[PDB]
Design a protein around this nucleic acid. Sequence first.
RNA 1: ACAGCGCUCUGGGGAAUUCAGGAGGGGAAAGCAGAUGUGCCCCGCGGCGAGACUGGCGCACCGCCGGACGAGCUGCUGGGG
Lengths: 212, 120, 331, 242, 31, 141, 28, 387
Amino acid sequence: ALGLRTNAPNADLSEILPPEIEAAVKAAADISMGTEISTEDYENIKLLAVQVVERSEYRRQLAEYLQNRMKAISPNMTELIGALVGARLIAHSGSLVNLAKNPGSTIQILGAEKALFRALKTKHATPKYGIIYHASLVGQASGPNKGKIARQLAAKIALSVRTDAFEDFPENADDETRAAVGIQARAKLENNLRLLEGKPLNKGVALGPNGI
Amino acid sequence: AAWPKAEDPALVQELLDCVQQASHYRQLKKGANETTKSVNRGTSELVILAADTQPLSIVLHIPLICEEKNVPYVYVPSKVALGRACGVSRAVIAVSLTSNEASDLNSKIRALRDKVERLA
Amino acid sequence: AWVADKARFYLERAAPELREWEEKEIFTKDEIRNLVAKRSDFEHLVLAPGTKPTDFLNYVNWERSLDRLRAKRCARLNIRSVTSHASQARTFGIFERAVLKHPGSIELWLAYLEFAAQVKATKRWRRIMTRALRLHPMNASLWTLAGRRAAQNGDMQRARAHFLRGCRFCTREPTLWLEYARCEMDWLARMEAKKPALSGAIPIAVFDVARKQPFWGPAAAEKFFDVFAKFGHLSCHERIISHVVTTMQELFPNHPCTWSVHIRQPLVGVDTPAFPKALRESLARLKAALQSTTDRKALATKMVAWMDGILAIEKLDAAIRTVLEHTKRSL
Amino acid sequence: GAKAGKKVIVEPHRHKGVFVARGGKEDLLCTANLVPGESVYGEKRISVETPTKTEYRIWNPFRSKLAAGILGGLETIYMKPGSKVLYLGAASGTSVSHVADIVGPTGAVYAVEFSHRSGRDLINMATRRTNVIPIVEDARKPMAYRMLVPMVDVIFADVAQPDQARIVGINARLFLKQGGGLLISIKASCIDSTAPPEQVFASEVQKLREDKFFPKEQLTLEPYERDHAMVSCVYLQKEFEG
Amino acid sequence: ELSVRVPQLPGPPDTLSDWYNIPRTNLTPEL
Amino acid sequence: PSSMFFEHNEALVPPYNVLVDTNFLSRTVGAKLPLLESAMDCLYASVNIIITSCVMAELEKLGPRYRVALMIARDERWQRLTCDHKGTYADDCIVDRVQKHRIYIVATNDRDLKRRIRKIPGVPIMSVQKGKYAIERLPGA
Amino acid sequence: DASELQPITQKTSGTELEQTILAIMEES
Amino acid sequence: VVNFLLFESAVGFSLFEVVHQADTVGLELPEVKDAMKTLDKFGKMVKLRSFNPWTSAAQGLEAINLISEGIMPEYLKSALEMNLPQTSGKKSKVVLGVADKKLAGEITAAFPGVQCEAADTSEVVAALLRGIRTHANKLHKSLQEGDIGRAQLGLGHAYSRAKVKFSVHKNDNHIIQGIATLDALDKSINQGAMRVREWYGWHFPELIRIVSDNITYAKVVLAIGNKSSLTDESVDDLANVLNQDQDKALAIIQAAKVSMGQDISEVDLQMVRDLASNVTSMADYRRILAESLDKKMSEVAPNLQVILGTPVAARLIAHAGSLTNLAKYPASTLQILPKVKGRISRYLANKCSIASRIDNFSEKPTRHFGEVLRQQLEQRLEWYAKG
RNA sequence: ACAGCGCUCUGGGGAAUUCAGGAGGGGAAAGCAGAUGUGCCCCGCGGCGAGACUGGCGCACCGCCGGACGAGCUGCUGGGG
Ligand SMILES: [Zn+2]
């Protein structure tokens, strides 16, 4: 949008980013020290900016397509963790029926396999989670409740993937009843998360000023 | 383009006589690439550059390395005379004459680079 | 920080005025203890290391309100022996160490000039104005304040001194040049109303030197004309306006500002049968301007702004008013 | 030699901002790269991926008299990170990049070069590094850049001139703080080509003392350059800072 | 505009401030 | 230091820098002996002959009996090395100067300073021996 | 006295503006 | 005895008025040096009288290029007319203190009543301006808008570039970063084309066997729609895609008639055609970069362009780092960057070093020396065949 | 372990916390060298200063140095109204 630095007081920039951010760009365009370039090279710079903005628009619509296809394939797991982490799990396992043959302890540490097998072969302590860490529901916890919620979420993911890969439906089945196991598991798991977070701290003896 | 140009009154011929003396003493590197490698290896004491060169950019690229390493450089006005003074049977456009810990040529080198530092 | 030992002097200086106020019946002893505590807190805030012009202005406002309160109370209790001179002296002291500490704050400089002008100190005002102009020479507001107050006093040579040094400095923006032409033509109007000056060649000279400045745009020359078009009741006003129009026509031929001065030229000193005659002349110029080859959106925005300025006045005919609306709406 | 791909470890030096990277058969000297991922003059640089943006650049002692002096063992080099350095004799900006990498982003290096094509190389490397400003002017006339140079803390002086002590004297009279550090690199064959180098160094130290410096250290940086000395001195005091 | 603060109250240095933050040695057996 | 090959100072080549002590200066005025002429006749080379401000200070601190030796020292054609230290003690000034730079020939006559400067490698000692001067540890002479 | 800003004369006139204004006021 | 003193800095020039002037006999004294160190005992000496900032960086550039050359500027004469008391030196003078002797002579010649003392000659005004340069950040901070560091930085860059004429013959950054872009997006074009080739041959597997040139593959999967809707020469496209009537379109359509791949959905076809539009947009940008980089190479270094060819020549420039580094390297370093092959390699390295230094050290270079050296390489290519 | 050496002894370590000191870095206009209300007028002293004179010197001859009048403007914490 902003052309060269000479076109800076006549530029319009509020459509892409609001002011209190992009008045400093006009101030720095007035006070900067970059060398002058011709417009015949600014064609190449503007055209590479065209290229990277088009790549970003295509990546955004690819993310929307991945979300729609994940809600088509596996509605339970998409209701549990979301389309991106579900797609990562499908990617590492190879396919949906190949993810469904995995135990919940496997689905907990998919992706952390290097640290896992290093620890198992050197008698260290194994990693607590894998791809599951960048889901939504394990990111709200903090402390050891993170690992506890990772275990419980991986077990519910195993149940939901087995349901979404083996259960039949009458084909006039709404998505709200096709994602029923995911809805129930997410509600129960959020209740267990808020119990684990609302566990109170240890009581102590409240002492006065004397020590009595 | 060649601002430390040597002038006529018995400085060009003092330069070329010291060049011939060092070429007899085997303490002299001939040609642009050998002058460049001698300056970059730092053994150079003074460097003579021709100014009658077809396009002058060669003996313009040498003074940058000479100014970065801080060695004196000076232009003589004839590459044919520089080749005749070296004893080459070819025209030489760049001559760098090095340093040794024990010689009697180094007195001529020192007086010559004093005159060149006064020329700059 | 030796601030306690530094503020001891100002409190010991303000003490005998409080002794006079206590030996008169004007302030009681508890109120004088309150004045002592408030001036002490103000002095230890003022002479602190990390201070501010708003802190200096709060102290100035408190001392000046104390002088006003004591004036009201002295007039109510019918005393004439108590004078305001010590309060004005200590307020000048606050302001002098204020402009010593923060010389780069024009709010405090202008508050100092307002105080010195308000308590009748003209020579002190001129000295403060000289120091403020030396510290902020690029400030068109300070330069116009100096020149306009010297013209209001009537020392036109001193007003020209301030204005010509100001136009020597402030050459980025047209503002001080427009104000100097305004002050010179106001002097011309004063020379007319008292009844060289007969020619009135000084705004033409201002225009001829302003032709080569770094602000010299057609919008700047239109600002010159919009300054000149006020107070047309003069002698050489048609000469000045015609020179501005022929300068803009010879330099910027097809600019919408030049077409705007071609529109609004013949309405100089009109208010009345000469009003709609020149209006019909100007509307002929305007219709030729609208049909002519110029940036019509820019010229139309200029004309709807001038037509809001036209519509701001009463006492006209409804047919003229509705044809201004009809010519406005399709722009 | 010190081949590309060898693993080295990077420990801090005794000086501030300088590091020594040791490994295997060769220990070398380095400074933290200000602009990472690009070399100035095609030097070997050291990448460490911290548990990316961190890179160190190797400091050639045969190319730069400051690194020659640091490997010789100066007691101090006066340039901590965040200290202003006036570099005199900034020919093409090779060692000025390492001085700017020492003083970091919060310092400043005022690099004075006289020749113009060396000025082009200096303006290129100072386009890369935003804390070195380039000044193409003659160092013999410091009235030219008195608008540009504020009162610096360290002066480096690598000019090869016979009037070197007078040049540094007037530049330090104009732009050096009370108790100001400087390092001057004296080349005896350019000061006095006839006289022995130890006598040349003593004469230059005496000329600095007449031009109001107090010399505190001197080393002949011998395994890297012949007949060169580096003299460290403090301007107008005996201690460095205060 | 002006918000409630987050109260964040609950030896040798980790990174050297003068040497551009070299991290302390993770003394692994390979090191 | 550079130019030192195993207690052989290669830094001293003519013109010889010769530091003068107060004992040497008082005795070379007492022996009716011209200072620069006898130093040049001893070394067969051009000397430049320097006197520190500690040496001038001790010559001034001695009374007005030594006014002739003071004027002889205060001859204008000689270099005056100003010293930046406190005590004005000529022996420690000369030894610190020589230990730092070591280009000088120390001209003394007291055996205490002579034994003090014999410990350090490569400085000659010039002393007056009742007919002329005598240089001690200079190899070229 | 550098207390105030004195009126300009032909000696302390710098620019073409002050020269032309002083010429007009001299012809007045 | 000083009355006022000028002090010029990168933000502007300010003149201070001294009160309680400095002792001139005890200038080398430790107590007076400590007074010049401490701001609490030097601000008693100086009081800021006037300040004049620049209007713009152009005025600051004109200010340095007048002051360093010696000549005073008109606005410095203006501010001195404003601040100094107007005198002529017959019965009372004003002592001003300035840093430079030529500026002193000119201010004294412009104002006859002002006697100027230069800092290069007078030690009192030297120490006093030295103290002001020491404490110059705090003496101005009440009216110092921003800082002085970035002002000095940008002003030193502007002064050095105006002295050197840097931008008119420094041009190589566009070339080296254009090479970086060209290689990066050539790799990205090939990778995206391989991805769309696999992910569309899953649907229609005859297109990989029958069609190469993956950019034309991306074009035909942009224009083909689905497998079901094929016709040969419908509108505007295939005649200038390739051969039209008797060679290719029939074969693609009989491949569609005998085709057996999986049926694709509408949204999946939408995503594949979006990826193909992405790939062909990057290919169009590659050809725009190649044309513009050939023109920029012919503007910057034409001799290297004609002796090597612009891709490999600009690769060599980018690997060397700059044209100045490429010219400073000798020919053996340019070799670093049977027998006849190595002999021609050494000869080419010699002539490429000569072409690099010729194309670099010119102001606006030429063509014919590279033409001569390319003719020399061509006649050597003829010379090695006789043997 | 023996023999030897060093440091130290209301034995020796670690933590929390209270008080008494020391060294260094950074930040701060960080500025009480003589602290007297304003305005006008008169006096005295002093500065700019337009203009008008005058004396002597001037063998590179091209120019110097010095007196005393002064319209107008202006400063004073010098003192008085
Ligand atoms: Zn001494």
